[PDB]
């Protein structure tokens, strides 16, 4: 469906400004590229992060069509492109890579050692994004078929699904029967994390959050236990495990305090994944500051096969994110709502 | 036999060890008695003795020596698996044997060993630095065959420790990968040898000492650069700016840990093997590459120990030893303290 | 404790088992004595009893029962790490404890056991189908807390055996995988449940009996196929002709293996878990997809058994029991022959 | 199940939250109850309104000092209760071996401070959880087939007023007059108690006319609106002779002032209501001769069994509003805004 | 003593009985649990085994043996009229106890028994061919004193049936 010549989009146009709707030219797919008609485009707290970057630290980028969480159908194929038919429902894999280094050749393109130098950026974070009537994707490599899954349900999974899934997959061998996984932060990512831990592992899930509401929600989504986050959370958790320390801690908050709890509750030979972002917050990995053999990493999005697996969980009804639907023209309005945390789960814009 | 034996002991806090006379122990049921063939020293024996009285609970007196090698002297009851006169190495980090971690083969990460007050020989249990010692269980004995006991003693630590640190991420270290070893002291020295024997990875060494760097090349580092402010850059120049798959910090200083974070590749790995009270890696967004994982590993597994012995017997590992007598325990520790030992000190009674 | 006990025993080749009187055994040093709380019986008991005299060296008489649970009755000398009256299940496949294989977890694959004549209880050593049982080492007992010993018993084999077979290729069984289970009889039943619990793969059940199929659906199979010459194409129909990531053949018959070679995916896996003397996969070019690997797993590891226990304690494994009495031992073995027992038979003194 | 929901106070100045904790195990001498009702009370608000400054060694804390449940498992050696038995939890635990306790006045134990014997839900695990530990058998009183929901408030709002009255019951012969200040809440169970255990005249005093009218229906022989006109009003009703006993459940300086002006010679003032700072002023000519004042504390075990007996004989009725355990923190909010009719009770 | 017990059941249509080893029943309120002393076989228990899937209206499994004699092992709650160890024969054609026909002793002609699903021991209820047995009520036990159980068993049908026919 390329028909248009002109298309609607939401762009970040000026540093520190709010995003604005625009009428820009309808792109045309070059050789090797695919042009999608967008069916859903996701908001994310990551989006405010980049728009909150100061003018001092700004080099290049603008204008920028936002939206890294992209779903659509195939509109027009570029030269030489096969492996998709016009109409095929695809999700846009976010973390673009060179395709040619060792990492990309193992599926792990989110860890491409070349994207940096070659200035390969993801859609809606340096490349034209999903929040528009149409979109370009650089390679068929970056399309995952979703069949008849509702695009509104798919969009949030390209991040809120993939991100935690990758975090969990890094250590899924250690999450055998009898293991214990602590999920800190039952917001967007932690919500879907629990659902995941339930599908792919036999581990026992203990949830940690601030809000009382978030605790009972956690139990409903498959957490076997829930404690309140603070100075007391460490003890609270240990109490439950019979003082055994937890196999894996997935910290989807990523605050200093939450990292600190993670360290206090992680098992010997365990693992801590710092998934959420609070600038400056870090784990302190040194002797007698963390159990022996306890590994810590800040992982980053996910691999292609992982996103493929995410969709399978979705299609099998195993994942479910609370989704609230908006309109291209309400784009700015939606981002405003995001800033005030007046959205449960995930805002999704539908051209 | 004899009902008395010479032993080196840490007897009072903040004091130097001393040659003492104590009774020759007798092997309970399950236990094994060894005649010690070789008993190693390392700076780890120094780190413990430098704990202040303020933090002293219930340790002393303590026969020193975690690096244990010997020959089977007398089987306790029911023990089989070794005939008397068998050469065995004493596996260090003892565990319950019954927890999940122990049943996976990773005894060094036993979840109950702390609770049950199970401590390793020379760090809480009678050490190897004596004429005889008891091993609680035949589970903690590795046959070494005709391997030289003096050779084998360093390997129980200086061999096993780095082998573990490496094994943790050995799938990552395929051809085309770069591994950086910081601290070509005792551990680093054997680290390099292992890296060469078990992987095709490129090895870049980092150290303070010119001479250490030269010897790093000899044992098989492709390149060597000086530790310091500019070591990060130095490494990147060598790697065309690509950054290293794995970094094995055997120094463990804040400086080194810092260097390691500046040179680790995305999705790579840092392994903080050296102890410096208070030095830590800061793992957070934009303070380290995505996917780079950090860990402080602890000694090694029993299977690991067996593999180290195998490398040694095939002639693939090699550390310079300095041989002392029981009565030189104190002497040797002092030499160790001034760092006038190249490689590893080994007591032979 | 009395000087007598009964035991079900195979006393002569070709014979039937008999309830017999024999000395109650006493624990030596390192041994544990158990009051048997349950003693499961499986088809492989019938397998060994069917071996002819022609091929026979030694072994008689034999207390039957390789699936055993009990309570600690008396501790041998020097045996700590277990209270009297503790409920414990007995790790089946004993090994040396000192070989590389054992030092890793994988005792079931011990390289020495055959040479030192270390046989499993019920298969060359005093079994569980008796009032009292000797276990050689502590490391062969797994705590079961308050799990029902009658539930526990089939888990030591009908649980352990599939769990291991699946564990071997569990990383292949992510979302979107298909796992095929041929045989829903006893082992196969618990396999489905395991797959549901430790993976997210789709489960396709295959059997000869339609009532077993409908119960395979109950425990979590996403599809049922009838075993036969029609089974292969039907499985392909289910998978849109993509093939199955792994095929777990718990039947082990030539027709089942043949079925498996057809439906298995490229880079897939076949686990031949059931025994039919002679049945064998034909792994060679164009007779099986490229990268499809085949294995005959043997039983399982201590760590796995611990995990199998955790599942049951958490409610995720439910095998149907039919209990008999110690006197009824031979009766049950007759009932087992005529496929005449629902699920797993357990004897209970 | 090896864990259970529990309504806990986790950090000073915050709201309570339903968290998951280990289902405790009854030691030798302890009893495990499956809780069947847990009362909330304004006393619960008082404790969580204490500033961190005045806080040392409390948290976390399962709340709920008004407990009733069923015996779930008997600890070692504990004899004299059966599984399934319905019991109310005695609040103010004591040493059991000092004079005060040996007399049966556990609420007045002289060692309990020094032993850190704190009551359930005010320093020890409370009743607002699926299950409960009670330290010894002497702290359970059977309730038979009494509705636990009706029971629960009786462990505090029944016991507390009963003790207050019990202390001076000899003086409440026919012809005596008892004034009750503060009808809602404790004073509602007070009036009922007065009518059952005595034949005194009962004079209700409140601010809310609605509570006053329903105090009549429960056995108040007269009503008066609290204020600076309260004294005069009450004198008017006794012909100036004053009241034998004033039971002030409000506990304000205002109410205590009214009281001191209306009590009879050789009478008594029981200050049951807690208003920090509020105090009677007992000195010559600032109060009638022979008028005694006291701040009473909860009640005795015997007294509790008596309060149970009254309720089982249908002599005590208090309006309960049911909440769920999940609604623990929610209910605490409602109490905070005085929008609870009578006494709230959580049912796991 | 004995939480397990031996029994003989018809287990499914077409085939022949088997020696199943099922659980030892317990006497509910008003029931009596007997140690079986003798269990009779009859050409009755083979006419019921030759019923073709369709007609058969009992339900399996089915401990056989409607000719049953025993000793009082354990009394159920509030069951007076018998002591432990009393030698007793089992009255077969159980009835409601409440209808006119039952009120006259003729339980064998109970007009409710069919409708209320009351069925004779070993002919719809657990029978006598076992180590133990339950009798639903004390009214279905007839004392046999010192009569040889082996001799008594057949009477509960081989005697009673013609006796009634003749009476
Ligand atoms: N732990 C992670 O990888 C996260 C991935 N995203 C996308 C994203 C992309 C870029 C940034 C830049 O700061 C942050 C976040 C969503 C949540 C956290
Ligand atoms: N990183 C490790 O586990 C190392 C093993 N050893 C034995 C030992 C163990 C523990 C300590 C105190 O930490 C020191 C020494 C040798 C060097 C470091
Ligand atoms: N594939 C396996 O290892 C199985 C484990 N068992 C115990 C067993 C089985 C077969 C043998 C060889 O007779 C030995 C022991 C039960 C079924 C199959
Ligand atoms: N006057 C009393 O004794 C009261 C008993 N309680 C329990 C309570 C109350 C006050 C305290 C001190 O904060 C402690 C405990 C309920 C109402 C008033
Ligand atoms: Zn996002
Ligand atoms: Zn790349
Ligand atoms: Zn050392
Ligand atoms: Zn252990
Ligand atoms: Zn078996
Ligand atoms: Zn072995
Ligand atoms: Zn209260
Ligand atoms: Zn006292
Ligand atoms: Zn008959
Ligand atoms: Zn009738």
Give the C-alpha separation, E158 to E142, whole Å: 16
- In angstroms and rounded to an integer, the radius of gyration of the C-alpha atoms of chain E is 15
Give the C-alpha separation, E40 to E6, whole Å: 16
The 3-state DSSP class for residue B57 equals coil
Q: Determine the distance separating the centroid of ligand 14 and the alpha carbon of E117, expressed in angstroms.
A: 11
Cβ contact (<8 Å) for C316 and A176? no
CA C330, C333, C337, C338 torsion-angle sign: positive
Pair of tokens at residue D18: 């339903």
Task: Please list every residue in chain A whose beta carbon sits closer than 8 Å to the beta carbon of residue B275.
Answer: 287
Q: Which of D147, D102, D140 is nearest to D120 (CA)?
A: D140
Cβ neighbours of B106 (radius 10 Å): 26
Whose tokens are 């806990």? That residue is D8
Q: Where are the beta strands (DSSP E) in A298-341?
A: 323-326
Alpha carbons within 13 angstroms on the beta-carbon side of residue A195 total 25
Residue nearest to atom 12 of ligand 3 (CA): C44
Q: Which residues pair with C34 in a beta bridge?
A: C72, C133
Phi, psi of D238 (to 5 degrees): -105, 5
Pair of tokens at residue D65: 């000092």
**DSSP for residue B116:** T
Phi, psi of A52 (to 5 degrees): -90, 10
Cβ neighbours of C18 (radius 10 Å): 14
Cβ contacts of residue A116 below 8 Å, gap of 6+? none
Pair of tokens at residue A341: 């945390």
Ligand showing the shortest atom-to-Cα distance for residue E108: 14
Give the C-alpha separation, B7 to C348, whole Å: 55
Pair of tokens at residue E162: 């013609």
Cβ neighbours of A18 (radius 10 Å): 14
Pair of tokens at residue B107: 């005894």
The 3-state DSSP class for residue D45 equals helix
Pair of tokens at residue B146: 């005709």
Assess whether chains B and D touch, using the rule of 3 or more C-beta pairs within 8 angstroms. no
How far is residue A45 CA from its own chain's centroid? 10
The 3-state DSSP class for residue D330 equals helix
Q: Which residues pair with D86 in a beta bridge?
A: D70
Taking each helix axis as running N to C, give the angle between helix D159-166 and helix D186-197, from 0 to 180 degrees, rounded to the nearest 10.
50
Experimental technique used to determine this entry: X-ray
Burial category of B115 from C-beta neighbours within 10 Å (exposed 0-12, middle 13-18, buried 19 and up): exposed
Structure-derived torsion over alpha carbons of residues A24, A48, A299, A241, reported in degrees to the nearest 10: -140
Give the C-alpha separation, A321 to A337, whole Å: 18
Report yes or no: D154 and D308 within 8 Å, Cβ to Cβ.
yes
Whose tokens are 């309109």? That residue is A327
Cα B268–Cα B272–Cα B278 angle in degrees, nearest 5: 130
Structure-derived torsion over alpha carbons of residues A340, A341, A343, A347, reported in degrees to the nearest 10: 80
Q: Which of B305, B322, B323 is nearest to B156 (CA)?
A: B305
Q: Where are the beta strands (DSSP E) in chain A?
A: 6-12, 20-25, 34-42, 64-65, 69-77, 89-92, 134-137, 143-145, 180-184, 204-209, 225-228, 246-251, 266-274, 283-285, 295-297, 323-326, 346-349
Give the C-alpha separation, A103 to A115, whole Å: 11
Ligand showing the shortest atom-to-Cα distance for residue A158: 5
Give the C-alpha separation, B94 to B123, whole Å: 11
Pair of tokens at residue E7: 């029994």
Q: Which of E73, E76, E54, E77 is nearest to E131 (CA)?
A: E73
Report yes or no: D293 and D272 within 8 Å, Cβ to Cβ.
no
The 3-state DSSP class for residue D157 equals helix
Cβ contact (<8 Å) for B97 and C138? yes
Residue nearest to atom 8 of ligand 2 (CA): B44
Alpha carbons within 13 angstroms on the beta-carbon side of residue A202 total 25
Give the C-alpha separation, A290 to A283, whole Å: 9
Q: Where are the beta strands (DSSP E) in B99-236?
A: 132-135, 141-143, 178-182, 202-207, 223-226
Q: How many angstroms is the resolution?
A: 3.0
Task: Please list every residue in chain C whose beta carbon sits closer than 8 Å to the beta carbon of residue A178.
Answer: 306-307, 310
Phi, psi of A215 (to 5 degrees): -60, -55
Report yes or no: B91 and C108 within 8 Å, Cβ to Cβ.
no
Q: Which of A243, A254, A146 is nearest to A190 (CA)?
A: A254
- Which residue of E3, E4, E20 is the best one to mutate when testing the C interface, meaning the one whose CB has the most C CBs within 10 A? E4
Burial category of C346 from C-beta neighbours within 10 Å (exposed 0-12, middle 13-18, buried 19 and up): buried
Give the C-alpha separation, B95 to A153, whole Å: 49
How far is residue A173 CA from its own chain's centroid? 22
Phi, psi of C205 (to 5 degrees): -90, 140
Give the C-alpha separation, E87 to E70, whole Å: 6
Q: Which of A176, A204, A313 sits opposite C200 (nearest CB)?
A: A313
Give the C-alpha separation, B332 to B311, whole Å: 28
Give the C-alpha separation, B240 to B70, whole Å: 48
Count the helices and strands in chain C (H runs, E runs).
9, 16
Whose tokens are 């894996």? That residue is A248
- Which residue of C101, C135, C303, C310 is the best one to mutate when testing the B interface, meaning the one whose CB has the most B CBs within 10 A? C303
Q: Where are the beta strands (DSSP E) in chain B?
A: 4-10, 18-23, 32-40, 62-63, 68-75, 87-90, 132-135, 141-143, 178-182, 202-207, 223-226, 244-249, 264-272, 281-283, 293-295, 321-324, 344-347
Q: What is the DSSP string of C134-151?
A: EES-GGGEEE-TTS-HHH
**Cα first-last separation, chain C:** 14
Distance from CA of E69 to the nearest CA of C (A): 25
Q: Which of A35, A75, A38 is nearest to A331 (CA)?
A: A38
Phi, psi of E153 (to 5 degrees): -40, -55
Ligand showing the shortest atom-to-Cα distance for residue B109: 8
What H or E segment, with its residue span, contains residue D70? strand D66-74
For residue B281, give the chain A residue with the closest CA.
A285
Give the C-alpha separation, A30 to E150, whole Å: 100
Task: Please list every residue in chain D whose beta carbon sits closer than 8 Å to the beta carbon of residue A212.
Answer: 15, 17-18, 329
Cα D144–Cα D145–Cα D151 angle in degrees, nearest 5: 85
Taking each helix axis as running N to C, give the angle between helix B254-263 and helix B231-238, from 0 to 180 degrees, rounded to the nearest 10.
30
Phi, psi of C182 (to 5 degrees): -95, 120
How far is residue E36 CA from its own chain's centroid? 10
Distance from CA of C104 to the nearest CA of B (A): 4
Q: Which of E78, E70, E72, E91 is nearest to E142 (CA)?
A: E91
Report yes or no: D347 and D329 within 8 Å, Cβ to Cβ.
no
Pair of tokens at residue B46: 């120094």
Q: Which atom of ligand 4 is nearest to the CA of D298?
A: 3
Q: Which of A277, A275, A246 is nearest to A262 (CA)?
A: A246
Structure-derived torsion over alpha carbons of residues C266, C271, C276, C279, reported in degrees to the nearest 10: 30
What are the residue ranges of helices labelled H in chain C?
A: 43-49, 149-152, 160-167, 187-198, 210-219, 231-238, 254-263, 302-313, 329-337
Q: Which atom of ligand 1 is nearest to the CA of B290?
A: 3
Task: Please list every residue in chain B whose beta carbon sits closer than 8 Å to the beta carbon of residue A274.
Answer: 283-285
Give the C-alpha separation, B270 to B246, whole Å: 6
Q: Which residues pair with D62 in a beta bridge?
A: D8
What H or E segment, with its residue span, contains residue D32? strand D31-39
Phi, psi of D302 (to 5 degrees): -50, -50
Give the C-alpha separation, C45 to B138, whole Å: 33
Q: Which of A206, A255, A248, A197 is nearest to A230 (CA)?
A: A255
Cβ neighbours of E100 (radius 10 Å): 11
Give the C-alpha separation, B266 to A283, whole Å: 18
């Amino acid at each position: 469906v390329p028909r248009g010549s002109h298309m609607k989009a939401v762009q970040y146009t000026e540093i520190g400004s709010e995003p604005v709707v625009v009428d820009i030219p309808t792109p045309t797919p070059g050789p090797g590229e695919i042009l999608l008609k967008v069916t859903a485009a996701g908001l994310c707290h990551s989006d405010i992060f980049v728009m909150d970057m100061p003018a001092a630290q700004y080099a290049y980028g603008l204008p920028l069509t936002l939206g890294h969480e992209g779903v659509g159908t195939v509109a027009e194929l570029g030269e030489g492109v096969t492996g998709f038919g016009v109409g095929d429902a695809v999700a846009v894999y976010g973390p673009w890579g060179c395709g040619a280094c060792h990492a990309c050749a193992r599926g792990r393109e989110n860890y491409c050692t070349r994207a940096a130098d070659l200035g390969i950026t993801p859609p809606g974070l340096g490349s034209p994004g999903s929040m528009a009537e149409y979109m370009i994707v650089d390679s068929a490599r970056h399309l995952v078929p979703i069949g008849d899954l509702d695009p509104v349900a798919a969009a949030p999974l390209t991040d809120a699904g993939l991100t935690p899934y990758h975090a969990i997959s890094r250590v899924l061998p250690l999450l055998g029967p009898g293991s214990t996984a602590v999920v800190i932060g039952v917001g967007g990512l932690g919500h879907v994390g629990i659902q995941i831990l339930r599908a792919v592992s036999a581990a026992r899930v203990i949830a940690v959050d601030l809000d009382d509401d978030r605790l009972a929600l956690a139990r409903e989504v498959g957490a076997d236990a829930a404690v309140k986050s603070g100075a007391g959370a460490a003890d609270a958790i240990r109490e439950l495990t019979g003082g055994q320390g937890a196999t894996a801690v997935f910290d989807f908050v990523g605050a200093q305090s939450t990292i600190d709890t993670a360290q206090q509750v992680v098992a010997v030979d365990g693992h801590i994944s710092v998934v959420g972002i609070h600038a400056g917050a870090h784990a302190k990995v040194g002797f007698f500051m963390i159990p022996f053999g306890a590994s810590v990493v800040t992982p980053y999005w996910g691999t292609r096969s992982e996103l493929m697996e995410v969709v399978a969980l979705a299609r099998a009804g195993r994942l479910d994110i609370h989704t609230e639907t908006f309109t291209l023209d309400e784009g700015p309005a939606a981002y405003r709502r995001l800033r005030e945390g007046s959205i449960r789960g995930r805002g999704v814009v539908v051209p």
